[PDB]
Each structure stands twice: as structure tokens, then as C-alpha cells.
Amino acid sequence: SWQTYVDDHLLCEIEGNHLSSAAILGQDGSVWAQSSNFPQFKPEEITAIMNDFAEPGSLAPTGLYLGGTKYMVIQGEPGTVIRGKKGPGGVTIKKTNQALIIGIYDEPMTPGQCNMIVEKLGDYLIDTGL
Numbered sequence: 001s002w003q004t005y006v007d008d009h010l011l012c013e014i015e016g017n018h019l020s021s022a023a024i025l026g027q028d029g030s031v032w033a034q035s036s037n038f039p040q041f042k043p044e045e046i047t048a049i050m051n052d053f054a055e056p057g058s059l060a061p062t063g064l065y066l067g068g069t070k071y072m073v074i075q076g077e078p079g080t081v082i083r084g085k086k087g088p089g090g091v092t093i094k095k096t097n098q099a100l101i102i103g104i105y106d107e108p109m110t111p112g113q114c115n116m117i118v119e120k121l122g123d124y125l126i127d128t129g130l
Contacts, residue, residue, distance in 0.1 A: 006033045010103075014117055017109035020089070022118075024125070025100045032099055039067025039104075046100075053079050053095050066091060066102070081119070083111075090114065094122035098130045 010022035010033065021039065024032040029046040045065050052059040052073075060073040064084040071084025071091055082093040089106040092114050101122040105114035 003036060007035050009033075010035045010121070012117070014109075014113045017105075017113050019103045019109065019114065019117060020106045022101075022103045022121075024121075025102065027095075027099060038102075039069070041067050049082060049093060049100065052082055064091070066104075081115075083115070085111075092118040094118050096122050096125045096130055099125060101125065 010024075011018045019035070021035050021037045023034040023038045025041075025046060026032055027046075027050060029043045042065075045067075048059060048065070052064075056076075056078045059082070064071045064073050064082060066084075069086065071086045074083045074085050074090075076083045076093075080095050082091075084091040084093075089104070090111055091102060091104050092111075094101045101118050103114050103118040103121075105111065
């Protein structure tokens with residue numbers, strides 16, 4: 001199925017762990033691919049993410065929201081990666097040329113394993129021009 005194809009690619013294991021959910025979203029807020037339990041998210045959340053890629057530091061004062069859940073903004077990569085923390089879990093968002101890769105993690109996955117999955121996904125996509 002398309003859903004199995006997506007889950008197999010986004011929820012792949014890394015060091016024995018896997019993302020809780022993940023998506024590839026267009027920079028327009030559309031869905032390119034979403035894993036089976038990815039949250040329902042709001043258009044304005046994607047706008048806020050895009051404006052933090054354009055003007056880094058803009059999201060931090062008020063927090064990163066995705067699916068109505070608030071994350072503390074922590075150090076990303078200027079213009080390219082946003083990271084958020086909520087308890088022992090969090091999120092990594094990587095900008096591509098036309099899209100965004102989002103991975104959400106929880107224990108026992110580590111923040112570094114989330115980063116590496118999401119980062120690598122995004123490099124893959126960018127290398128194909130997307």
C-alpha cells in the first residue's frame with residue numbers, strides 16, 4: 001500500500017529505535033507523505049515554521065507548535081533545521097528545496113537518533129532536487 005511504503009521509509013529503525021511519527025510536507029502546508037500516526041496540524045503552524053527558516057529566532061519566544069502541542073525551541077541549523085523539546089521527546093524539522101521533513105520522537109529514541117533520521121531523509125530528498 002502507499003501507507004506501508006511511507007511507514008517503511010519514514011519509520012525506519014535506527015539503533016533499534018524509530019520515530020513515533022513523521023511526514024514530508026510541502027512548504028505550502030500540503031501533505032506529501034505522512035506516517036500512520038502523524039498529528040493533524042494547522043496551516044498557521046507551517047507558516048510559523050517557514051517564517052523561522054526565513055528569519056531564524058522568530059519562533060523561539062513563543063514556542064514551536066505542531067498539532068497544537070508546544071515544544072521549546074532548541075538549537076537547530078540556521079535556515080535549515082528546527083529542533084524542539086517536550087519532556088523526554090521532541091521534534092526535528094528539516095527544510096528541503098520544496099518541502100519539509102518532520103520527525104517526532106519519544107523515549108527510548110534519543111534526540112540524536114531523531115536528528116540523524118530526519119537530517120538524512122532531508123538530504124536524500126534535496127539531492128533529488130526536492
